Amino acid sequence: DPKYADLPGIARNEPDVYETSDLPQEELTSTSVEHIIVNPNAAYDKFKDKRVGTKGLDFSDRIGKTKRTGYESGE
Amino acid sequence: AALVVDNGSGMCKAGFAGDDAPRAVFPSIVGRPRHQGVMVGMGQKDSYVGDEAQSKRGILTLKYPIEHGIVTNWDDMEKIWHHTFYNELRVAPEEHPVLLTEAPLNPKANREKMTQIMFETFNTPAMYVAIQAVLSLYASGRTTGIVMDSGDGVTHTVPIYEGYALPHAILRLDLAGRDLTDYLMKILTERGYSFTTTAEREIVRDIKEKLCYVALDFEQEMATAASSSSLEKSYELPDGQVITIGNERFRCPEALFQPSFLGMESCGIHETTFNSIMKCDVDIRKDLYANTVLSGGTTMYPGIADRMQKEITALAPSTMKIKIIAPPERKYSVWIGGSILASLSTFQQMWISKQEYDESGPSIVHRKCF
């Protein structure tokens, strides 16, 4: 009796939850495009020590020479 | 020769080719009275319709048979139809091809069902249904023009160019003054007035049309109203009550510019129309400023033309010369355009006969109605 005789206007006997009952791609047939089985370390060893050098790494839309192709120095 | 019947969820009209005034003019709403349980004598009609229902509006409840194109019951709609025919013209449908209208966004099954029953029930020789906007610019006098429909429950921006147009360019929001009627009725309820039945709706739509003028900036207008309440005009109803409103009057159509009054996650009529213009050619958009054609029955309110003009004026550059075409008769003009359409023999060579549905079925409805 927290407030039974005290206050007769407070809720009880209420099942306000509203229940229910327990009642519970890879079309590779085509020949469209391949994939590669990821192995980050394999590709890491693939691109292992490419000493690419960026001498004059310029790719602007400048017009003053013949052509521009950076990422060119090697070992 | 023909059978011209303009339609509308409210205003439904009729007559024939060459006629300038629609013979049939009535509210196309379905009235359902208070059928109670105790006995009574001498009876009445099962459910009076529009004018029939308005005559005895005290019991008859004119609920909507359509909802922004969503026809509730085809049966009741036919009752409206049949009685209207045998109320106004009293002519059989086998006389001439019929003429009716519709608007987009409608599932093709509705227009198919429509025409299907039109041949079923009526067995007309031929028939035809079109788009209101076509008759609008058709009666206007252009093949290149952007208009917008503001009926009782519809809104749609139609840009045309030499007759050509694009469905992608034509935009649509089927929202209109009925929503405003709801908004206005509830805010006046907040003011302290009772509103339960459909007669409440009728009186408020009445005074709504009687007071929805268009001012410019509600901030200063509101400031002047609170300052001087002289704008708060009074009006005595059929009942002894006399209400006084000033803001309410013109601020009710401001929701057309702002969905914020209803919180609709939408855009203003002006910017919506602007985007419709944006779906075009840079040259023809200029023509839209030139062909700023206006329609819709809920555009019989003074001031908004200058408003929308100023809106797009702030939107479009100064070089875009605005040329608003504002016909104050656009409401009836669709029916009139239908009559003019019914006057061009070539169009009356193009038809939808019996055998088309009898054999072809309803696919010709998709490729022949428009």
Binding site: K3, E14, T20, S21 | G37, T189
Partner: protein, 370 residues
């Protein structure tokens, strides 16, 4: 002053009050109007027969009781003056307006004039140092502890459904129809009118109220129960009126869910309810269908929750079951929420200082009303 503030509550049928810390409102005082039945032959009597509780139980000769706030719609205020005045009098809480701040709620969908008049009393006549006005369902939520949930409740003459998630609710999504128990009492006596009994004044109305809340229940199959057979038990008044009732003892859902069968224009709690829920976010709607706060101080009958479940089953997207919530007593939850409200930091940022009222009043009332 840092005393315990007065927490006045409200109610169309049962109005409450209290302090920030009371766990029980000391008086379960109903909302009514004590008056004389005839012109008192001798002057200098119990002026207006302002009677409360035992004073109302004192005599019955020249005593006509009414309501000063019909179904939440309050019209006059002199009765309210004396009622509040009696509360202010040192028989209720033995305190003053100035001695304690006052918390109070208000029913929605009301004109501002009500708020105007009340604040005029509370600051002009009586002097509240810090007041406040709020809602009711919010307080009920605080009592239940939920801050979310489809709130639903129904007072003595006011019914309302408010969809809520974290307190948020759209006014468009908020629905309310003010019709409950008082008219049920009117119809109980109307049932007995068909049965031929005593019908002269409010005394019988009191009797019928005692019946309604005492010698009345609600069944589930009115067609079956109407076609069934009972011997119709009776009651004993101070006269000992052994009167039989029958179906009329439980003919109330034809007022709750089907009041239109009394040739009336309404919908049904469940209908308007579900519609308001449908105004929300469909998926959030689905989630909140599992948590629908059900309440109501008048909805105190067995089986009616099952009838509501039947409405649910007819309206829920089937197999998404929603069982019965059966809260028996629903009164003080609002009073409890107000006690918890004023007991927290809330009123400190939510008061209405008398000074600010003196400065602006209605301006401050509505600038701080939300």
């Amino acid at each position: 002053i840092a005393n315990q503030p007065v927490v006045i509550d409200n109610g169309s049928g049962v109005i409450k009050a209290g302090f920030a810390g009371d766990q029980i409102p000391k008086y379960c005082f109903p909302n009514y109007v004590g008056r004389p039945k005839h012109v008192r032959v001798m002057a200098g009597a119990l002026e207006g027969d302002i009677f409360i509780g035992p004073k109302a139980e004192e005599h019955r000769g020249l005593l006509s009781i009414r309501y000063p706030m019909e179904h939440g719609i309050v019209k006059d205020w002199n009765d309210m003056e004396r009622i509040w005045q009696y509360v202010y009098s040192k028989d209720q809480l033995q305190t003053f307006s100035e001695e304690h701040p006052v918390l109070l709620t208000e029913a929605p969908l009301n004109p501002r004039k009500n708020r105007e008049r009340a604040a005029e009393v509370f600051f002009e006549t009586f002097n509240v140092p810090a007041l406040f006005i709020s809602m009711q369902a919010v307080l009920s939520l605080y009592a239940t502890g939920r801050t979310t949930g489809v709130v639903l409740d129904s007072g003595d003459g006011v019914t309302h459904a408010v969809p809520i998630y974290e307190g948020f609710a759209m006014p468009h999504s908020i629905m309310r129809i003010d019709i409950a128990g008082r008219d049920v009492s009117r119809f109980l006596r109307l049932y007995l009118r068909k049965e031929g009994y005593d019908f002269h004044s409010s005394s019988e109305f009191e009797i019928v109220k005692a019946i309604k809340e005492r010698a009345c229940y609600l069944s589930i199959n009115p067609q079956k129960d109407e076609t069934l057979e009972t011997e119709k038990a009776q009651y004993y008044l101070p006269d000992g009126s052994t009167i039989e009732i029958g179906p009329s003892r439980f003919r109330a859902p034809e007022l709750l869910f089907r009041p239109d069968l009394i040739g009336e224009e309404s919908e049904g709690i469940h209908e308007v309810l579900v519609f308001a829920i449908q105004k929300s976010d469909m998926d959030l709607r689905r989630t909140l269908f599992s948590n629908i706060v059900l309440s109501g101080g008048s909805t105190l009958f067995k089986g009616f929750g099952d009838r509501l479940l039947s409405e649910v089953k007819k309206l829920a997207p089937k197999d998404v079951k929603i069982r019965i919530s059966a809260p028996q007593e629903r009164l003080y939850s609002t009073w409890i929420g107000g006690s918890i409200l004023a007991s927290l930091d809330t009123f400190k940022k939510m008061w209405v200082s008398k000074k600010e009222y003196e400065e602006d009043g209605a301006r401050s009332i509505h600038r701080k009303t939300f």
